[PDB]
Amino acid sequence: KRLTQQREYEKQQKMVERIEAQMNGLASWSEKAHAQSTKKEGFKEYHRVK
RNA sequence: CGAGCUGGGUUCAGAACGUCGUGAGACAGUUCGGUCCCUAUCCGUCGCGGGCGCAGGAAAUUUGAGAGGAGCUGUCCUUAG
Numbered sequence: 001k002r003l004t005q006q007r008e009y010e011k012q013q014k015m016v017e018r019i020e021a022q023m024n025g026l027a028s029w030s031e032k033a034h035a036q037s038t039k040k041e042g043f044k045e046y047h048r049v050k
Numbered sequence: 051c052g053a054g055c056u057g058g059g060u061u062c063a064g065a066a067c068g069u070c071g072u073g074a075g076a077c078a079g080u081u082c083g084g085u086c087c088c089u090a091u092c093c094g095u096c097g098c099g100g101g102c103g104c105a106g107g108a109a110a111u112u113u114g115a116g117a118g119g120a121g122c123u124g125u126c127c128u129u130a131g
């Protein structure tokens with residue numbers, strides 16, 4: 001039972017670190033995609049919607 | 051300056067790559083293809099007429115108020131090594 005609970009805790013801790021990493025990558029893209037708008041090509045809301 | 055024109059780019063539907071997302075999809079990217087409608091009423095422009103005016107009716111030649119246009123400049127020689 002200690003092996004079962006240790007495997008399931010290792011799985012949810014690994015999954016938590018994975019989703020926090022893939023959430024941080026999207027944040028570091030949303031900061032760029034908000035700051036690098038308003039420069040050229042399309043007004044400023046076609047790029048703010050992204 | 052698209053009721054003047056083009057539509058190559060970008061931001062419609064197809065599709066693909068890189069990348070993200072479990073996912074439908076998305077871009078923090080790139081790539082190929084993609085319907086540019088309208089018989090001009092008025093003003094406004096460019097032209098041409100028709101009426102009347104101008105104290106008679108006519109034919110010609112006109113002054114010019116005013117207005118538009120034009121208004122650019124190279125090189126070579128001489129002066130003179």
Ligand SMILES: CC[C@H]1OC(=O)[C@@H](C)C(=O)[C@H](C)[C@@H](O[C@@H]2O[C@H](C)C[C@H](N(C)C)[C@H]2O)[C@](C)(OC)C[C@@H](C)C(=O)[C@H](C)[C@H]2N(CCCCn3cnc(-c4cccnc4)c3)C(=O)O[C@]12C
Pocket residue numbers: 085086087
């Ligand atoms: C043929 C010209 C067409 O114009 C355009 O489509 C296009 C050239 C334009 O630019 C036009 C002016 C557009 O306006 C623009 O709209 C934009 C959204 C906005 C723009 N401004 C507002 C900024 C505005 O200018 C708009 C919205 O049209 C979509 C006008 C709107 C009233 C229409 O939809 C309109 C009724 C179109 N239509 C709908 C069917 C279209 C499918 N179809 C295509 N071919 C056939 C077909 C062929 C052969 C036989 N039968 C059918 C059928 C037609 O049948 O004819 C149209 C008038």
